[PDB]
Amino acid sequence: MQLRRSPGMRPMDRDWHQERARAREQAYSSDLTSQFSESEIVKYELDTAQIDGSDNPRTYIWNRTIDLFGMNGTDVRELRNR
Amino acid sequence: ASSTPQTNVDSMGGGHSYQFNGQDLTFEDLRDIKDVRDSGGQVAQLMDYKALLNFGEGCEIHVEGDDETKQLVDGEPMTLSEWLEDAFPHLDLLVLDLGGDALWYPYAVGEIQETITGEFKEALPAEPWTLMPESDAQGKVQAWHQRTKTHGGYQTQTLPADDLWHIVINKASARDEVGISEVLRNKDEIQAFKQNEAAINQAIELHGFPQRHVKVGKEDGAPVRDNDLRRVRTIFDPRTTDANTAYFTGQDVDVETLEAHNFDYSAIHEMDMRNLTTALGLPLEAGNVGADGLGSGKPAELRFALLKLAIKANQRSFSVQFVERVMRPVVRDYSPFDHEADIRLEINDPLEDIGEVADLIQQVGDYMTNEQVAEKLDLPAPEDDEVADSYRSPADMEKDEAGV
């Protein structure tokens, strides 16, 4: 008998996909204990997700405190040479 | 030029594998269409109204120069139209079934059937959710792949495209032989509709009704425990209460109310319906919803023009394919007539105002032959060819002949 939280069932759950994707987009690093709830780490099996901050758009978008040139909001992975 | 196409088509790939496209759909996607169709409620009723508008008004068969076809079929004369009307006795039902299927699914599909003697029996539809086409490098259907429920699972076969027939209403391009499901095309709008319906129903249960909240004890006073609340719950139990119950208390009992928390579920329902009806191309009125300034005048005339144009486009698309891929093969293989004849199948317009057509005839009948009048009026032409061909009324000639 399988509940939605049961270990053999997690890959069938739409929310397990959605929250793992959403976790990768929120993180700045692989340090899960710092960034997430113990509940999220267990429920979405975040040890197994390749969380490292590389999939977060704010890693690449410039957001300098003083901007005289409208440079903020440019994403480096969208330039000519990326 | 050339005798085979020399532009390529997108319509080739790794079969029913793990990629996503409108022609690359799986048997699971076909059963997903079937589940939306089966499960009823508002979504199914709208798509049934769409089928009834396009195909529910019935049909007529024409042959250009029909009388010239006159030939003995079985010791008695028929024309090709008379033979087709005997070959397809219940064509009004068949057109509604196939026309319905071809709106829901990417295609309607079926078989020719013979008697044991080998005379034509019927065109027999097949369950479209069970069948998918296999296509060549130029997008033409080579084989049909079927899977169906069987004792303990699914039973599978392949059939040659040479002895099925299929019809496509919705297409990605005029080159597309596989077509598009309007259900799968608009699946997001269908999901959004169903989610908001569930959300409204749940919200009505929680929030649509007031609820009693008895608070017990003085504020900053002695605490009241669960066993103490049990003896209070007994006094105010809603199952035991009746409309004109009165209450007597000390100062430290408060009968508060969770009010019904007003939200405009009517406007949410109207918004969902406006989204879904327009997604399915129906007028808003098909969903039992209306709007200001759209009920009359040029604003009404336009939306009904758009609807009638949409219907004509579907009707012609179906009519041509049914004649070319069902009727002509049946004439060719089971009939003494010429299959290259100018057969037409025309499907009736669902929204004709007979009273407007009648008033048109009053105004300009003086410029129409009696047969043209009979056609517009939807009646058989006169039995006498000069009467049929003449312009002035059959009654107006008949009263003059009575003058002889």
Partner: protein, 282 residues
């Protein structure tokens, strides 16, 4: 955009028993097939002497079909939130598990109760082993028409120069299409081939199953790697209370948010004449 709406399949075992044996759709879960005695020789006698009796004696092979079952239970919270139809997936799995069940019952009877054996002792394991095994059955006055084969045996057989060389096979089909070649189903007088999976035979290592007498395989001293037999003399007896065949039912719990799918079939497998069958041994 939306995530991948897909599941990748596991290993699928080869299912052949319904084709590779005589199938009886029994009216009862237990029953009997009647068997006649062997042919004899009319005895010499003098003139005017009494003709002695030696009439046809009979016996039976009993069938005793066992309910194979497989089941699954899932919460409606999971069923509603699934990537794909979980009930369709569990239906397909349950159906597959019962077909695999039939094939285990069939193959275990087929291998254990075949009354003849050809021991290859290594050496000539290809066409010569099939011809020798037909010889063993022919020597008991039956004629086989089918063979059942392990993956190891298939690999040996398709390395045999008598099949792998177009000159020697008379066609290049075995070299081109291997198992799908028409010669592979038309060899040594056998007009059918039934390619089995390795896991099919009952080792007794699987839960709820207690093993057969042999080792099924073709890669170590004493393994049985093929069976050459008469398809009309091995019976697969299927019984179902509510139809001809496997029944799947959709359970829904009276109280909890639980749904499930359960399949069942009753199967037995029995030789009519075990002498009509020979195993091939490594």
């Amino acid at each position: 955009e939306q995530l991948l709406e897909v599941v990748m399949e596991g290993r699928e075992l080869r299912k052949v028993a319904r084709e590779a044996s005589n199938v009886i759709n029994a009216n009862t879960r237990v029953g009997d097939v009647p068997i006649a005695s062997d042919e004899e020789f009319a005895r010499p006698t003098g003139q005017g002497a009494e003709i002695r009796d030696d009439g046809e004696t009979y016996t039976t092979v009993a069938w005793n079909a066992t309910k194979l079952t497989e089941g699954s239970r899932v919460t409606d919270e999971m069923r509603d939130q699934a990537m794909v139809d979980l009930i369709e997936r569990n239906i397909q799995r349950v159906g597959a598990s019962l077909e695999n069940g039939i094939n285990r019952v069939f193959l275990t009877e087929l291998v254990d109760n075949a009354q003849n054996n050809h021991d290859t002792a290594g050496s000539n394991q290809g066409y010569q082993a099939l011809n020798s095994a037909v010889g063993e059955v022919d020597k008991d006055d039956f004629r086989p028409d089918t063979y059942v084969t392990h993956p190891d045996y298939r690999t040996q057989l398709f390395n045999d120069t008598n099949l792998a060389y177009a000159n020697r096979a008379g066609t290049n089909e075995v070299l081109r299409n291997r198992e799908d070649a028409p010669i592979v189903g038309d060899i040594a007088g056998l007009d059918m081939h039934a390619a089995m999976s390795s896991a099919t035979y009952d080792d007794g290592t699987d839960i709820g199953w207690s093993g057969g007498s042999e080792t099924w395989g073709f890669s170590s001293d004493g393994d049985k790697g093929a069976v050459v037999y008469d398809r009309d003399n091995i019976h697969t007896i299927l019984y179902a209370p509510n139809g001809q065949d496997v029944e799947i039912k959709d359970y829904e719990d009276p109280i909890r948010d639980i749904t499930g799918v359960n399949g069942r079939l009753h199967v037995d497998c029995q030789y009519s004449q075990g002498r009509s069958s020979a195993t091939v041994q490594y």
